[model samples]
Target: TCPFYKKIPGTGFTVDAFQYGVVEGCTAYFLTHFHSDHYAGLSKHFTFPVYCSEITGNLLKNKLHVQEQYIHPLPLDTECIVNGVKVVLLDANHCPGAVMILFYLPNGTVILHTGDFRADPSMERSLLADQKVHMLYLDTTYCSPEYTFPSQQEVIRFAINTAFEAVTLNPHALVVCGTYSIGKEKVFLAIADVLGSKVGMSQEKYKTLQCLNIPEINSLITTDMCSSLVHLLPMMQINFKGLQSHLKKCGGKYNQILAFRPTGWTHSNKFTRIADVIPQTKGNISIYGIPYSEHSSYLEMKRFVQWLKPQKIIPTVNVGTWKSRSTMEKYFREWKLEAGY
Candidate 1:
């Protein structure tokens, strides 16, 4: 019994198919985003009609090689009927085309599935307008108070200024931006625009962005390694040994590789220093993990929960652990008591 898939009381159906084989028995399926974790079991062989944002639908077809006929794209903030259930898609504020799924059943129950998102003030207003949320499926990726970090816009400014300084200080150094396959496109776009240069990426990354049709970033893609001093690489490529090995093999004129990894893990308690300026070095390459995250912090989560005041809270991740549910309830109670709500 997967927590991501819960039967809607009397509806005799489930929401998102987080697991592969689970989709077979699902009455209908909704895809929140194209993140591998969210779509782990989904593939080109999916059997059900999947509902998602238009950009996510295109990504499924162009990048994942999924057939287009199985996809049903829903415009943001629009309500559509699917299998007798009223479904509405809202902006998730996480990545391009990410949406929070809202389901209104025939029995006057409203359920919100926040797959993965950072809550925006306007989005919260729209979500809480004239409706009672029965159940909330939350993205508890940063559900602990220790994970507090700055806002994304502030982090973006930090990254842009830091990257600019890095490139300026070391003219021979290559700016290696660390990013995931789908997320963190904003970091590269801002860096490219401010620095007046194109960012180098693999053909696959180029194709992924091309599918989004974002004109601002379309002209920033450069496949050639030396096309620009700044190189946009995947998150895995910024590792110590990986970058060193890559530079050794592909070293031409650049003597150093200054890397910036915009991620939530940077602020994790595992590291001693603040995520903004902390640096790790290996040989001729250096890496910094900035606290740039698309998920909400514990404070943010508490504020959202108090605002929504749902009857039940459902954590999407870490549900497999035996003690996870109990521990999460404890955390929720503590947060509510502190907030006095």
Candidate 2:
């Protein structure tokens, strides 16, 4: 019961740990990023000190709205000993605050856990700085080459182009998208960037971004200005009734709305509620699906495995699930055959 495992007893939730308690000698718990899947049930069973990069800590605090006291913020390359275990925080460049943690055991065993990561020179520099890593657990979210990950810049370009292109294809259409509040600033910027010559922030997006203190993605927007190019900037209200109120506050300005909703619309076929809110005048609003997945694809996962070359790669995130080791071994074999590894 001390081991952290997916599928906690009989609960339908796939990932929650059902352990009675953490091991008495365990040093620190690590949250690589603020993603919901990685952080669910964090405050429940384990009360030990949690370690993460400072930025990740802030994202949990300010953006994801996690309580601040649970974290002991550590910077990249900083090492600390907790409960007789040596812990090191390594940079993970996938998202703004993502990280990989290295745990040096008292028995001279080194275990590296990649919360979620991607290949970037900065992360490589950080990882290589360790001189020697014994065993590495990678973010093999993408282990198949079929997924040629577009760089973040390219992804922004694609998102912008996709949105604008959809608008062009249906000049009178409304485009709605669903996105997470955290790590979605870039996506918003991409949407706005596509409308560079005609960037106007709906009062909602403007005010929300202001409250979050996000740096302006583009300089074209002003407080007194609204753009005719894109009509609405919509996000899932989630638990906030204020979003609905804010929209009501916009009133007539919401005509010809272009909204970005969260992705769960397909769950209940709730397009009617979507249609209810915006103008249903012909094809003015179209639901365009653009998923900006934070995790690595199968191909990306394989490449990382090759790069790390760990003697024993224990995939904890997806352990005991088809997505983790079983599928990974298959993809690894395929990749090895192709590369003659």
Candidate 3:
């Protein structure tokens, strides 16, 4: 019945594992990123030593108000000693501060914990890319064949062109985008740059941008909502009803509204054309569900496991059901076994 597991056996460390108040002989904590799903259960009343990337560390102290004393910031791509283990932080490509943890245990064994990541060709150059990873703690967010979607650049280009087409036809069309706190900023920024328009955002999003290292942010966003035709809203508020209500609240300047809810969950392998991507419509309000994903696709995950050939695999997501977990175990075995037991 448990959808999540807090402890990484024999490591004496709990990764993104907070709610379980009392740890079992485990005192050290490791964070993968600032996403709520990963950092759930972390409270201001929390007590324990925490480790994470520099940006993530800053976010924890500045945004989350977690105490500074318990936080330890580690540089990306650099090796450091933590509790007698040689641990290194590497870019995850999922979010601004997300990272993959590589641990060199005292027993001469190496373990890789990929918190949440989007697999790319650059990953093959990772420090442990060709090394022997005894066990791989994988991110199974898109582990099934059903979750495969288009590439990030592919989907991003689609969003920009779609919005540009609407704007070319009607200047009064207000193009809005759905964005997570730190994810999918690239899509909006690309659209803003290509269209030569400033994107409007809320004070909440402004605060998040202030915490990030996005260099194009300064000129891409406009403080006054009236100065721009494109805007961004939270991912949850990109629905048709929400867009219509918000457009209605913004006065009669924009007769039509277009929203881009960019997420991988919106697409599957069955899509063969663009109409399937933009199936939602309500009068003058339209919502496009683009396949923008931060996690690796099923094909990418299979390739990674095959190339790494780790002795064992531990899935980090979607393991709640016996049926769900059973299929992935078979996939892992099929991919990782050749000469290794």
Instruction: Give the top-scoring candidate (TM-score).
Output: 3
Q: Rank by lDDT, descending?
A: 3, 1, 2
| Local distance difference test values of all predictions, in order | 0.77, 0.53, 0.81
How well does candidate 2 match the true structure in TM-score terms? 0.65
- Candidate numbers, best TM-score first, in rank order: 3, 1, 2
TM-score of 3: 0.91
User: Candidate 2, overall lDDT?
Assistant: 0.53
**Candidate 3, position 84, lDDT:** 71
Assess the local accuracy of residue 55 in candidate 1 as a C-alpha lDDT between 0 and 100: 91
The TM-scores of all predictions, comma-separated, are 0.89, 0.65, 0.91
Q: What are the per-residue Cα lDDT tens digits for candidate 3 across 1-341? A: 11235565566877887766767677689999999988877867777899998788878888788898989989998889988777899999898899999888887788889999988778888797657889888999877777767788777777778888988899889988888768777888888777789888888777777677767667878656778888888888988778888888778888998888776675355665444465488899888777777899888988777777787788888877899799988777766565354
**Candidate 1 wrong stretches, greater than 4 Å:** 1-4, 18-25, 248-251, 266-276, 282-284, 337-341
Alpha carbon lDDT at 196, candidate 3: 85
lDDT string, candidate 1, 1-341, tens digits: 55534545555456566574753356766788888877776778876777889999999898777788888898987778887878889988888888888888788889888889887667767845769899888887877767777777877887788778877888777778887768778877787777788888788877788777577665677778766777777677779887877677565678888888877655364544344366798777888777777888777877888888787888886677868767778888986677675
Q: Which ranges in model 2 have alpha carbons more than 4 Å from their true place?
A: 2-24, 43-47, 59-70, 83-85, 106-108, 120-122, 144-149, 161-177, 193-249, 259-282, 322-324, 333-341
In angstroms, the error of model 2 at 66 is: 6.7
Evaluated at residue 112, the lDDT of candidate 1 is 87
